[PDB]
RNA sequence: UUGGCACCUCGAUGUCGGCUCGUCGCAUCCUGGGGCUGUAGUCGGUCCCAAGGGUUGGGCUGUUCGCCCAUUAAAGCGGCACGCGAGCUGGGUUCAGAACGUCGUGAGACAGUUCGGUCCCUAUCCGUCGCGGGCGCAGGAAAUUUGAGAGGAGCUGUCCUUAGUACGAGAGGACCGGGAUGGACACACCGCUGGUGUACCAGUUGUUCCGCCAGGAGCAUCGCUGGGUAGCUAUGUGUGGCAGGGAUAAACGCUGAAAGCAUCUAAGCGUGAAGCCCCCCUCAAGAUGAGAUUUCCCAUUUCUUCGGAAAGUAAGAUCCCUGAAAGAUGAUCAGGUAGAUAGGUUUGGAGUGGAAGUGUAGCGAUACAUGGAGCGGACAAAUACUAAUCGAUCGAGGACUUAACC
């Protein structure tokens, strides 16, 4: 596995942040090295989602960030990233065995020449 | 490796009973003393069981004459005539290395 | 003198009839074919050229296909020559099975050692460290490059550089078991290379 | 530690024989009709040359 | 796995309580001694009124070590502590009794009198 | 070595000892071969050949040296700026402080002592160790290779037997030969024994957070603690220096004159060292002397009076992309849908050690059940779900002379 110029705890924080971003936004632009690490972590969260039971929900909850995706209005209640993973994202990949993400190469960033990519759910 | 599993399968001793670390076992070990082959009982607590297939080993600890002695065996060695589980211990971990520092009473394993 | 090419599958152990426990390397040697016989008349030396593992057509080229067509076989991953063999044995296109060896046969295993990349003098040449304390600023360094007089460094001053990936021959390994239906040799002890490494097994020169 | 002699123009230029860029790996797209890096998305069309987005 | 300056409990009846290894015998640059090896040692602690006295330079055979011994069958033996027995040039012990268990490797090396006196030979 | 001289260096050639790394000489310490012996044997003495390899760890002292302890086959002597400070150390010496003895009226000083006291530097060139790119090698390619030449290796103990024989009055006690098993060293490898294992499992403290409980997360050295996979590893395991061959050294001879004898030598034959050259291991055709074998592609187009030129291609290779058994980067190797190359997924496995939820028992901490459970980086096998799309670029057309077949 990749060390992304970060200590162990910094790297876990980064992976959790990006994992949540990809579940929330469904399409993010990041560096190639980050995307090639994110696909592993996000596809395992979607697997937990497909599993669906309380034990898997709590394994996902230990990783996913406590972020509000949106407010739906029934009274109006927020929707949390974990709820989206288990209620929105997971089910759409019910019949698809793996390969929930794809990485499109974009081009180098101006300020540091970093090779940027789109990683997206599909 | 599937091919190494197939090649070694024959050497697996099926007589080996189910034991875990914490179990008291009596190892009937064959001993070549000069010319004739003897049977020497080594009875103690199973301290460790590591590895896979024909490479699997276990280690038995006893206090002989006030000195801790650890005997490590291949599980499937044919130099063990018989391995009998005397009592099932209640332990909370796979490796009982903490027993190496404890002497009688403090080193007692509860029976199940 | 007999020889074969196999891949290193991995290491395990076997109990002998005695009761002793010995470490073994499992060499899988399926699909060895005799491709070409070199004679003193043609090439200036006696050798049999053995092709080892079958290879997908698209991974071969027309030069390769033409060479193995002479022996009515498919392209081969590895091709190696064996010298000191009897050319009366070996027909072109003949399979070379592991039963050319028997239990107790003493063999020499040749392969390429595992790659360690750029390595210092401590790991690469087993040199001594300088002191780690007592004011020392010398720890994993190569030692003096030499005396002053020859205003230069002599030619075998051992220094850091790429470490493994060299051809190695381990001499006098006993064959412990020979399984024809599995195309498996069990060789006592270890042979050079990572798992899946090419290993050349031939009869011990000594 | 320090240069014993200044480096001549010739020697400096020889050293720089290998200090150069390579041409980028590019090719004309069919749908766009303009150059693009292989294995990248073409911005002119606005998607991956093959896979529509 | 005993070297110069290694201290050992004396597992016998002679005066010696503790010895310090002066030299591993049998080789110009031989670093380590194992079970059944003879070492030259000095007596650091004595039992008052014992035969062997403090400061005496003696030969001792190592009868058990924390670094154990491998056996050809593929089994190992390891003890809780390093003990030795003080011997004459003929491999007989200076003492009359041997204390604690003793490794079978002694019987092979031909320390027959020690093997006989030992309460257990593992 | 102690010295003599003052020739290089005072716009600086760092000076003792140690460490690291060695390399060379032989006047040889050990091991090999041999002559003489005041050589019975076992031990020795002395000389000759021999530099292949080997040649210990401690106590004291800044030490070198030396003495001592314990080993060893042996603990060699020298050179390399008393080898090696842009490699290290800095105890000693050779700075400022202070003190003692001593000398000096004194400031201060030492055939002396004592405690303390800044060791800078990003490597240009050659050199050394690794690793690429270019072109060459009378066509262009893909493999397999010969070995000119080079490097590596080269050590040695003990026990048993021969044999209590030979030898000796006894005491003691062999050569030669055969076998076993070590030390040190080297190479490989992780199945074993262990080590490590910061994206594996578990326990646990404080505090903050997830609204609360439950269950979790953050931070505290990875918070700490007990384990541990792959990988990397030694202290672990396997293997090696086996046995030879050729020519020699000292030496021993045979035949043999010169010199009717004698004489190993002049002609001529043989024996004969761990040494030389092979044998063993590795690199090696830039070996420009550019070698060999097998296989593949073929003689295209337009020009150039002319020689030649350029421009599409062949076999083949590369860019680019997925990577690891490879790796600083290049490179190498495995793959690119003619698809298991990587990720995911599904089954496993190691490892951990019994999840959550629920229930039962208990006043409760907790225990038990459901259930070798749950988790499970890097390991295994399947699976085309995701990404290896689509492209492009480079790359022959083979000079002349002579001979032989023909
Ligand atoms: Mg932390
Ligand atoms: Mg590597
Ligand atoms: Mg050292
Ligand atoms: Mg340091
Ligand atoms: Mg010169
Ligand atoms: Mg003058
Ligand atoms: Mg100057
Ligand atoms: Mg000489
Ligand atoms: Mg000097
Ligand atoms: Mg110095
Ligand atoms: Mg210098
Ligand atoms: Mg006075
Ligand atoms: Mg001072
Ligand atoms: Mg430097
Ligand atoms: Mg430079
Ligand atoms: Mg040359
Ligand atoms: Mg291991
Ligand atoms: Mg391990
Ligand atoms: Mg907490
Ligand atoms: Mg709570
Ligand atoms: Mg804070
Ligand atoms: Mg004569
Ligand atoms: Mg001869
Ligand atoms: Mg030798
Ligand atoms: Mg695979
Ligand atoms: Zn396009």
From Swiss-Prot, chain A:
Annotated organism of origin: Listeria monocytogenes serovar 1/2a (strain ATCC BAA-679 / EGD-e)
Keyword Transport in annotation: no
GO terms for biological process, alphabetical: translation
Keywords: Ribonucleoprotein, Ribosomal protein
Family: Belongs to the bacterial ribosomal protein bL17 family.
Summary of subunit composition and partner proteins: Part of the 50S ribosomal subunit. Contacts protein L32.
Name of this chain's protein: Large ribosomal subunit protein bL17
Pfam families, per the entry: Ribosomal_L17
Gene3D superfamilies assigned to the protein according to its UniProt record, in alphabetical order: Ribosomal protein L17
Keyword Ribonucleoprotein among record annotations: yes
Curated annotation (Swiss-Prot), chain B:
Protein's GO biological process: translation
Pfam families in the cross-refs: Ribosomal_L19
Entries under Gene3D superfamilies matching the protein: 2.30.30.790
UniProt keywords, alphabetically: Ribonucleoprotein, Ribosomal protein
A GO term for molecular function: structural constituent of ribosome
Annotated NCBIfam families: rplS_bact (TIGR01024)
PANTHER family: LARGE RIBOSOMAL SUBUNIT PROTEIN BL19M (PTHR15680:SF9), RIBOSOMAL PROTEIN L19 (PTHR15680)
Function of the protein: This protein is located at the 30S-50S ribosomal subunit interface and may play a role in the structure and function of the aminoacyl-tRNA binding site.
Protein's UniProt name: Large ribosomal subunit protein bL19
The species this protein was found in: Listeria monocytogenes serovar 1/2a (strain ATCC BAA-679 / EGD-e)
GN (gene name): rplS
From Swiss-Prot, chain C:
Subunit annotation: Part of the 50S ribosomal subunit. Forms a cluster with proteins L14 and L19.
Function according to Swiss-Prot or TrEMBL: One of the primary rRNA binding proteins, it binds directly near the 3'-end of the 23S rRNA, where it nucleates assembly of the 50S subunit.
Organism: Listeria monocytogenes serovar 1/2a (strain ATCC BAA-679 / EGD-e)
Gene3D superfamilies: 3.30.160.810, Translation factors
UniProt region (Disordered), positions on chain: 125-147
Keyword RNA-binding appears in the UniProt entry: yes
GO terms classed as biological process: translation
Domain of life: Bacteria
Protein name: Large ribosomal subunit protein uL3
Keywords on record: Ribonucleoprotein, Ribosomal protein, RNA-binding, rRNA-binding
Entry-linked InterPro entries: Ribosomal_uL3, Ribosomal_uL3_bac/org-type, Ribosomal_uL3_CS, Transl_B-barrel_sf
Gene Ontology CC: cytosolic large ribosomal subunit
Family the entry assigns: Belongs to the universal ribosomal protein uL3 family.
Xref: Pfam families: Ribosomal_L3
Keyword match Acyltransferase: no
One MF annotation (Gene Ontology) recorded for this entry: structural constituent of ribosome
From Swiss-Prot, chain D:
Endpoints of the signal sequence: none
UniProt KW keywords: Ribonucleoprotein, Ribosomal protein
InterPro entries the record matches: Ribosomal_bL32, Ribosomal_bL32_bact, Ribosomal_zn-bd
GO biological process, one term: translation
Molecular functions (GO terms): structural constituent of ribosome
GO cellular component, one term: cytosolic large ribosomal subunit
Family in the record: Belongs to the bacterial ribosomal protein bL32 family.
UniProt name for this protein: Large ribosomal subunit protein bL32B
Species lineage: Bacteria, Bacillati, Bacillota, Bacilli, Bacillales
């Amino acid at each position: 596995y990749r060390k992304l110029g970060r200590t162990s705890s910094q790297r876990k924080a980064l992976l959790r942040d990006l994992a949540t971003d990809l579940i929330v936004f469904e399409r993010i632009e990041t560096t190639e090295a980050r995307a090639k690490e994110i696909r592993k972590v996000v596809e395992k969260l979607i697997t937990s989602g497909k599993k669906g039971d309380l034990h898997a929900r709590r394994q996902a909850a230990a990783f996913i960030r406590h972020e509000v995706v949106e407010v739906v209005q029934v009274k109006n209640r927020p929707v949390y990233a974990l709820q989206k993973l288990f209620d929105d994202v997971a089910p759409r990949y019910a019949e698809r065995q793996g390969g929930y993400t794809r990485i499109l190469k974009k081009g180098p960033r101006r300020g540091d020449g970093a090779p940027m990519v789109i990683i997206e759910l599909v | 490796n599937k091919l190494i599993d197939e090649i070694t399968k024959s050497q697996l001793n099926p007589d080996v009973p189910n034991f875990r670390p914490g179990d008291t076992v009596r190892v009937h070990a064959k001993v070549v003393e000069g010319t004739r082959e003897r049977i020497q009982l080594f009875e103690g607590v199973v301290i460790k069981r590591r590895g896979a297939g024909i490479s699997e080993t276990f280690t038995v600890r006893k206090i002989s004459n006030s000195v801790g002695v650890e005997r490590t065996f291949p599980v499937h060695t044919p130099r063990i005539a018989k391995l009998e589980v005397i009592r099932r211990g209640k332990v909370r971990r796979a490796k009982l290395y903490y027993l190496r520092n404890l002497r009688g009473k403090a080193a007692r394993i509860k029976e199940i | 003198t007999k020889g074969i090419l196999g891949r290193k599958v991995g290491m395990t152990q076997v109990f002998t009839e005695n009761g002793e426990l010995i470490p073994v390397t499992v060499i899988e040697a399926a699909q060895n074919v005799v491709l070409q016989k070199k004679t003193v008349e043609t090439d200036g030396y006696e050798a049999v050229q053995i092709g080892f593992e079958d290879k997908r057509a698209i991974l071969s080229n027309k030069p390769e296909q033409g060479h193995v067509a002479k022996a009515n076989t498919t392209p081969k991953r590895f091709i190696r020559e064996f010298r000191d063999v009897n050319l009366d044995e070996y027909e072109i296109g003949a399979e070379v099975k592991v039963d050319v060896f028997a239990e107790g046969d003493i063999i020499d295993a040749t392969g390429v050692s595992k790659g360690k990349g750029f390595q210092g003098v401590i790991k690469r040449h087993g040199q001594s460290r300088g002191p780690m304390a007592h004011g020392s600023r010398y720890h994993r360094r190569p030692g003096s490059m030499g005396p002053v007089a020859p205003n230069r460094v002599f030619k075998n001053k051992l220094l850091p550089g790429r470490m493994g990936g060299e051809q190695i021959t381990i001499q006098n390994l006993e064959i412990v078991k020979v399984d024809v239906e599995k195309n498996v040799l069990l060789v006592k002890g270890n042979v050079p290379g990572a798992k899946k490494a090419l290993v050349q097994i031939k009869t011990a020169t000594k | 530690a320090v240069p014993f002699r200044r480096t001549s123009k010739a020697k400096k230029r020889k050293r720089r024989t290998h200090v150069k860029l390579q041409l980028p790996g590019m090719n004309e797209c069919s749908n766009c009709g303009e150059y693009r890096l292989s294995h990248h998305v073409c911005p002119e069309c606005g998607q991956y040359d093959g896979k529509d987005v | 796995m005993i070297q110069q300056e290694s201290r050992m409990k004396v597992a016998d009846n002679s005066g010696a309580r503790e010895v310090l290894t002066i030299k591993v015998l049998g080789g110009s640059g031989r670093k380590t001694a194992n079970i059944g090896d003879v070492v030259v040692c000095t007596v650091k602690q004595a039992t008052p009124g014992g035969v062997v006295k403090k400061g005496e330079v003696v030969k001792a055979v190592i009868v058990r070590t924390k670094s154990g011994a491998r056996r050809q069958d593929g089994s190992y033996i390891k003890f809780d502590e390093n003990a030795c027995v003080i011997i004459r040039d003929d491999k007989s012990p200076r003492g009359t009794r041997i204390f604690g268990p003793v490794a079978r490797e002694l019987r092979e090396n031909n320390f027959m009198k020690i093997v006989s006196l030992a309460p257990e030979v593992l």
